[PDB]
């Protein structure tokens, strides 16, 4: 659920999942459309797509458990939906960390009309 993902993001990047990553670019937020603005926005688009592959799962509210193996994010065994939601989130947290150097504040609270074009998952 959102509580596990937010804690995951804070641990990995040092930044609070709100506000940094809830209104960033074209895909860090709610839904999304258009062409991702930068590497961090692509992390969100890939994250959205990953959730997209789990139709009878509820990613935002279904809680899972994960542990740290010295820095590594190991998803704990849970229901089949929890395991898969955890892997989509771990991937996003790592992707955000991988692109911290290009994170740009000018993409925070990005207007909707500038999100143009199309990208299929």
């Amino acid at each position: 659920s959102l509580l596990e993902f937010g804690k995951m993001i804070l641990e990995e990047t040092g930044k609070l999942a709100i506000p940094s990553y809830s209104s960033y670019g074209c895909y860090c937020g709610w839904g999304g459309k258009g062409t991702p603005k930068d590497a961090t926005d692509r992390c969100c688009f890939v994250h959205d797509c990953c959730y997209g592959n789990l139709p009878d799962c509820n990613p935002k509210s279904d809680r899972y458990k994960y542990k740290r193996v010295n820095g590594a994010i190991v998803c704990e065994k849970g229901t089949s939906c929890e395991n898969r939601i955890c892997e989509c989130d771990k991937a996003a947290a790592i992707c955000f960390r991988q692109n911290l150097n290009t994170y740009s504040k000018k993409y925070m609270l990005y207007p909707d009309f500038l999100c143009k074009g199309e990208l299929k998952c």
Binding site: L3, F5, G6, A17
Partner: peptide, 5 residues
């Protein structure tokens, strides 16, 4: 922690 993405 809190929430989004």
């Amino acid at each position: 922690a809190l929430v989004y993405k």
